[PDB]
């Protein structure tokens, strides 16, 4: 079949593209004048934020243009050569905007394994833009204005050779999935899977030990027998012997903590409950000095991880909707999907799933620049 995608349903999308435009703009004009005003100088991490925030600002440039196309029920006003331009130029920046997020996330991973001048930015920066064009020639070619069969309207459409329209319009939809989502996300997610892997190795999980210390003290603090007090302390010793294994002096804090439990064990093997009790009253001040140290260090490991997550969420939250509907749109083109309740809704949804992909352009500035200042 072939639906009337025009309805009362897409009355929203003209105005959102404006919110996304004006909001996505101010936010991204800031990011440019930061780097534009003082520069890196020669800062590799801040050079990728620019090309991104630039590509984002070119995506967002054209949105009031496409705000027409959806306002005029898919009636393109600007004639068939202008349709080829902005169509290709949009795909160009989209693919570049995404592939710079790809870079940023690989940079941020290397920023974490080897925390220590720009040189290769000369390849990576052009090489992206270049492929963003080579990836956008198919779109320049097939894009064109056609009086569309059903609507009775002159629409800006990917006009393949009618003979095999199904074939082209599918393979093309697959090349979005692969080149715009499946690969970029292999790069972006496994990076998150490197920070998680190297902020677990570059560290220790001592809370398994710390709970023991905090548990067995409240036992000692309200003990009745010498049995319990000897019990609590023999566990609190093994806790500190592991914790010990794990520059920082933190290791001496566990030398001291052993040499405060051994002494109190010695009291508790005599049968001195009040003595042992008051002996662990002192432990608490060792533990308190060193628990407090541990939490200031783990909040530095915390803010690292939460931001490496928020990067891959912002991505998936904006570019999964569009790339699912594209994979269905594409399966339907092959002929795997037939039911037109589906194809009604695929071509009633892609409008919104698209607008989301452009929200990410509005968002990267908050993730990549606005954090830290």
């Amino acid at each position, epitope marked *: 079949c072939s639906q009337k995608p025009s309805d009362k349903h897409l009355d929203a999308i003209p105005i959102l593209y404006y919110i996304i435009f004006v909001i996505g703009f101010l936010v991204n004009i800031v990011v440019v004048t930061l780097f534009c005003c003082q520069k890196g100088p020669k800062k590799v991490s801040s050079i990728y934020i620019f090309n991104l925030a630039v590509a984002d600002l070119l995506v967002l440039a054209t949105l009031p243009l496409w705000a027409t196309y959806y306002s005029y029920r898919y009636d393109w006003l600007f004639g068939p050569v202008m349709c080829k331009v902005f169509g290709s130029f949009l795909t160009l920046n989209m693919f570049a905007s995404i592939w710079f997020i790809t870079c940023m996330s690989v940079d941020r991973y290397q920023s974490v394994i080897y925390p220590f001048n720009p040189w290769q930015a000369s390849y990576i920066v052009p090489l992206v833009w270049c492929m963003a064009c080579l990836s956008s020639l198919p779109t320049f070619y097939f894009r064109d204005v056609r009086t569309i069969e059903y609507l009775g309207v002159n629409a800006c459409i990917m006009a393949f050779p009618p003979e095999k329209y199904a074939q082209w319009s599918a393979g093309i939809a697959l090349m979005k999935n692969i080149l715009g989502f499946i690969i970029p996300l292999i790069f972006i997610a496994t990076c998150y899977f490197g920070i998680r892997k190297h902020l677990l190795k570059t560290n220790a999980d001592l809370e398994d030990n710390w709970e023991t210390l905090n548990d067995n003290l409240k036992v000692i603090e309200k003990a009745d027998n010498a049995a319990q007090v000897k019990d609590a302390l023999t566990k609190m010793r093994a806790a500190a012997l592991d914790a010990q294994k794990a520059m920082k002096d933190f290791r001496h804090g566990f030398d001291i903590l052993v040499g405060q439990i051994d002494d109190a064990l010695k009291l508790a093997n005599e049968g001195k409950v009040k003595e042992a009790q008051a002996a662990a*009253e002192q432990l608490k001040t060792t533990r308190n000095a060193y628990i407090q140290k541990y939490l200031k260090n783990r909040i530095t490991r915390d803010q690292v991880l939460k931001m490496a997550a928020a990067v891959v969420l912002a991505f998936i939250i904006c570019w999964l909707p569009f790339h699912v509907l594209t994979f269905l749109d594409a399966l339907a083109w092959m002929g795997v999907i037939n039911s037109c309740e589906v194809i009604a809704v695929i071509d009633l949804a892609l409008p919104f799933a698209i607008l989301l992909g452009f929200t990410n352009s509005c968002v990267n500035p908050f993730l990549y620049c606005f954090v830290g200042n």
Partner: antibody
Amino acid sequence: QIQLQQSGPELVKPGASVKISCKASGYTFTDFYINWMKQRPGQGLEWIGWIFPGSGNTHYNEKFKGKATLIVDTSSSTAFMQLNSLTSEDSAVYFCTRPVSYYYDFDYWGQGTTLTVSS
Amino acid sequence: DIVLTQSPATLSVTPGDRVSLSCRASQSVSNYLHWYQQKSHESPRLLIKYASQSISGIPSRFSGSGSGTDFTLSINSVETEDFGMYFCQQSNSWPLTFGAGTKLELRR
């Protein structure tokens, strides 16, 4: 009653070392944590370190580590604080004190060893 | 190191008046705070432990209060004997830290 007797004022000359004492009587020595303080006539106190006689195991304040040891004799039931490279800045009073404890009625101070440095 | 900031330094009481002594904390010290009295530079007398816990021997008129980051020692009626230093001490974490202290002196 529990008592702490500290050896009385030493006469000391710049750069020389010291060994201030603290006889402990009333309680069985090897069971309780013993601190050491400092005080300057007009100021508030400054904690030097704890020691547990039953082990000999210690900890100190950073400021004092460079220039303050602690040491214990079991048989005699007496505690020492060995200071060194002394100068006008150690012209102060010094207390060995069993610290405050929830499970006990009282804490237990010395009575203060007055230390003056001058050639 | 946990600084312990006593206020004020001097304070001219009258035998009969109630008085409050501020002892603030640069960071959290919990209830692990102890007050002290000292008259003639001698070994100081433990008045209150764990902020409000009463000491055997100390008269009723001394009462402690607050918790965590801000503590006070309310003497419910000062007498002639009460003059001298008062020092607050955190038992929270090494290094143990004292107040610079509040000197009480008679009004006239």
